[PDB]
Design a protein around this ligand. Sequence first.
Ligand SMILES: Nc1ncnc2c1ncn2[C@@H]1O[C@H](COP(=O)(O)OP(=O)(O)O)[C@@H](O)[C@H]1O
Ligand SMILES: Nc1ncnc2c1ncn2[C@@H]1O[C@H](COP(=O)(O)OP(=O)(O)O)[C@@H](O)[C@H]1O
Lengths: 557, 557, 140
Amino acid sequence: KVPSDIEIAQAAKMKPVMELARGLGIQEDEVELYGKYKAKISLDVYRRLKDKPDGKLILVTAITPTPAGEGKTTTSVGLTDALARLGKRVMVCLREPSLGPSFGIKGGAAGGGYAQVVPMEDINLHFTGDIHAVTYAHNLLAAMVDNHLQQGNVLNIDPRTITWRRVIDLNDRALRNIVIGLGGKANGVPRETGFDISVASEVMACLCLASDLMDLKERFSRIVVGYTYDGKPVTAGDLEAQGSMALLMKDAIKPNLVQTLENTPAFIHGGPFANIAHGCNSIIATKTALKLADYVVTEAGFGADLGAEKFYDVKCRYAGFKPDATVIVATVRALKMHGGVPKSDLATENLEALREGFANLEKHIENIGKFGVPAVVAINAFPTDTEAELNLLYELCAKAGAEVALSEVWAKGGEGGLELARKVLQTLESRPSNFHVLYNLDLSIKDKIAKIATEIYGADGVNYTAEADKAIQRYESLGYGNLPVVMAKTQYSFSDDMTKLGRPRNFTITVREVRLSAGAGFIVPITGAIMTMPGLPKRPAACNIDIDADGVITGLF
Amino acid sequence: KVPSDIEIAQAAKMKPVMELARGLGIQEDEVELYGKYKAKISLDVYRRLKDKPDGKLILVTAITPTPAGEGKTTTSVGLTDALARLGKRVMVCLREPSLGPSFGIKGGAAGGGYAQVVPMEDINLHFTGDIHAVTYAHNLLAAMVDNHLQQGNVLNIDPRTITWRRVIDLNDRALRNIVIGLGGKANGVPRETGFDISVASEVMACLCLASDLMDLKERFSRIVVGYTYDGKPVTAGDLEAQGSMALLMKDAIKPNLVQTLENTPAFIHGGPFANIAHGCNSIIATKTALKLADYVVTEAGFGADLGAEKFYDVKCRYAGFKPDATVIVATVRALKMHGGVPKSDLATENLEALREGFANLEKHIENIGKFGVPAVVAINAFPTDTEAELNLLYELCAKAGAEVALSEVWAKGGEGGLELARKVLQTLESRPSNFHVLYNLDLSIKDKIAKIATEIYGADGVNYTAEADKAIQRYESLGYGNLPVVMAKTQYSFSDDMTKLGRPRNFTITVREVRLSAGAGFIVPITGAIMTMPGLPKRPAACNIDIDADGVITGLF
Amino acid sequence: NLLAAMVDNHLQQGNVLNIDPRTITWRRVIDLNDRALRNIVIGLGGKANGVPRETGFDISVASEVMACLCLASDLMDLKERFSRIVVGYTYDGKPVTAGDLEAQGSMALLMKDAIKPNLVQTLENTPAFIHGGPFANIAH
Ligand SMILES: Nc1ncnc2c1ncn2[C@@H]1O[C@H](COP(=O)(O)OP(=O)(O)O)[C@@H](O)[C@H]1O
Ligand SMILES: Nc1ncnc2c1ncn2[C@@H]1O[C@H](COP(=O)(O)OP(=O)(O)O)[C@@H](O)[C@H]1O
């Protein structure tokens, strides 16, 4: 018997975040509660502590994802709980989930098992209203664009080249492509546009790479909404919108102090797209936790090929962060799959598969290697992984020359994470990390993409469509050449072939389109149509969700 | 002499709401803070005081609106504050403003001068996120309708008969008329629709008319979104959205405790339109106040002919309230506009036009009479009124059997309302009310409409277009005939012609359209052209809005 | 376009054949160079006005009707080909042809003079037929 995630977080025992705020030496006029159990820590905290030295930066990443599931949050949070069970002054920084999944597929634990962050309900509903403000700032900008068209279009924008869309945090496919502006001289200018899920907002992206508020304000100002008739780009700043957008963000820029079932301080702040964007919680939440703990467990989206890579290449580069360790997660199950084992064959023990599957992990370790960062494999263990496999895998990481550990934080709490914690410590004490950015700003865009594609995915090279080259020609020329590179591609493989599992070689990566996030300050190579607006299943969670007289919720998890 | 509104909202010391909370007999386990100066109060409070007697209910209303501004919210707060001075246990209930105005037309205070509920900024912006919840629940329903189409359209909704629009709390004209569902079979069902500003949402109206959560859930279920190809209604019940929507409103349902400049406790909750909806703050807020205090002041959008009338015929009806008194706000200024005087020369004394305009106010007093509620006029003092004009206003007011007070609450705060406060108290001590609604629900839709039109508006009779006659017959045959009537008409005339100021005679009203709010529980006849989505001006306030590092806001107020 | 008109009417009249409007391959045609018509949304205005859907126009000579005119052996053959024309698919993916909407006789009738070749001549009075005019890329 293990009870369900929800029953767990429910029977759990939360501590007023005000005391946790206290225990980290957050002043009480810097806390801003939302009930006894969530709060916004003013930015003033960091800026009074900007010199006190940063704790030690630990990134949790993982192997390329699989239907089997890796448990990268579970084990990013469990490690956190072990490090507190060892009297380390440690936090965990995490991403806020979109609201949308809650009502479609289902709501999920900020982690899972005995490695959750709480309160789980609030995290999955409106929480502190973070995403409501993004949405509202994005759409106020769009509002202002369409209105600017209505008022005579002084800036001579071609309505048909407007890249600025709209957001809503519901999986609504009906809004993917729409026409707005209908009904005459009074109601605007008809045009084609659409809606993406709000977490994919560039505004969401900025939230997460803004340094202070005035950085968010100015990033806003840089955003490309669309181009004039002569091809000249127009910005949020041209529309003199950056003010009001910043204003709508005033409270959302502040990170949200929650906690674990084991009362370790957690930040939850930001939650951007991991493909068309960098995949991390905000910089604010990390740079703050850094001045507040001696250890900061944090994480990034997908496998290490995308999350970690960008974590280093965009976030760390921006923030001046110098990560220290990095855990890479894995299962004998997720690895059996990378050895041509269909999801039904995860039942039978399979010593032979686990060997070839390993190729995925080894590749990652090398790639983490490539940053001057001390890896550590962590192994999320599963109820039917017979010990045959475990040691066989255990072997292969050491046989591949990097540290390895069993992780039982799912089933056992901070206790199951002690082993791994210790190695992270062994590593933190004895293994310094000369982190370097995998590339240089001044490289041409293609050079940059080559690097990542060649060095990280392990490809023989990159190929570029007619439009893709045309677009890069446009941007280098507009000056947007300096920026980093965010790699819009599948996650389920090192390649773009969503089915090329393991370490496929001989392949090349093909770049179909190239979008700009001037505001976030990056550039997005696309290697496959990107799902920016999911739709609801045949029967949405919504249909089965309910709340009674007592406030009892069913169907949410 | 008197500072600005924003200057005032920052100077005055706010008391931790938890105190105000306790001061009212609200247990700690019933208050959830949103910082120090905001709180949601539990619905458990009303339940634990179900059997205490109600304080006195006092409605603040006004003569016919002009573009000049009228005096209402400011009197509500000002009256409240004077009563607290006079020693009385008093609360004021107010509506939450939409986010929209803040960026286009203008963000003004919840009141003004020294008669303001605060914290200003938070009330005007995201507040405690109620409107966001309303927004998101309404659009989740929308999303669910379209998904229904896409998933085989089992309920057989004719997309084209869909009445459920979408909402956003921005002034976005371009969204009024849209076509969605485009892109292929993968992307939903192409159809026409649009957005309304969030506070026009039936969800908002249900929030404001609900008795608690399970009632709000029920109303939700009764919401009609569209019709089968056969003309049979399809409700949100039918798509099983009520639990989700409810769940999304679980914090939105509790009223928000806040306060005036003088720390008088104050509820802000709900915020509907006064034309397609009843334009009152919530029943939950009002009905709790009546338990926690001996005097509750609340108010209604637009003029007495609209807000007051709907306050009595809808709100009080749903709730079994009985107004003990009612204040009508008049200004010498506007009463002259009603006597012909254009906006440009309102400062010039003109007793004859003032005598003519009084007709407007006279008609309103008569109308409050018809509900059994003793009236008291409040003259909102302006520096350019002459003593002669004021005295003439008191003459007519008494010659019309109404007590009247001058009210300098905008400048002097609670003190400028003592004379009024005392007159109100004199009326309560000596003229106990005989409250009754204007009309019985038995009457047909056309009878109920006639009775309002003739008794209240002073209309001769009422006309219909063929479309209105079809709707009324549809609504009747579908059994919504015994519903209350909410008249969307212009606010600036008793007539349905916005130019016909003063006390128009020999006129007819025309009902062009009839929509239905089955969840809110009423029928909406439309007379003019009704704007359920304002749009941005030439140079929107959002362009002039900034915030710097010090947190200092400019061009927002 | 009569066929087109008949497809949409089919939708409006209760959509008995259960065409998914969105899978409709039968566009409309006009023998003008009109770019603005390539991508359109039709069927708007209310239940009185048809079924909103995406579609567009092709220049008339690209029309399959033109191609059938040019490949037909006579009228009854042109009628048959017509009937076999696929306009779209049921929600189930099964094809719905012009046969299914019973348009082939009408279309045929509309082509009763169109079917005969047109005799004319060269500058030197050598006899000359002009008849048919399809695209050489999507058609022959
Ligand atoms: N060891 C385990 N056994 C069973 N279920 C697990 C285990 N670890 C994680 N899970 C569940 O599966 C999901 C995957 O873990 P999570 O950390 O959320 O994945 P990721 O962060 O890689 O998306 C979690 O929601 C959790 O409930
Ligand atoms: N006596 C007065 N002198 C100056 N300004 C006033 C006075 N009374 C009201 N106002 C202003 O009018 C504005 C809008 O009118 P308000 O007082 O809210 O009345 P209403 O609710 O009828 O619109 C407020 O922001 C307030 O500052």
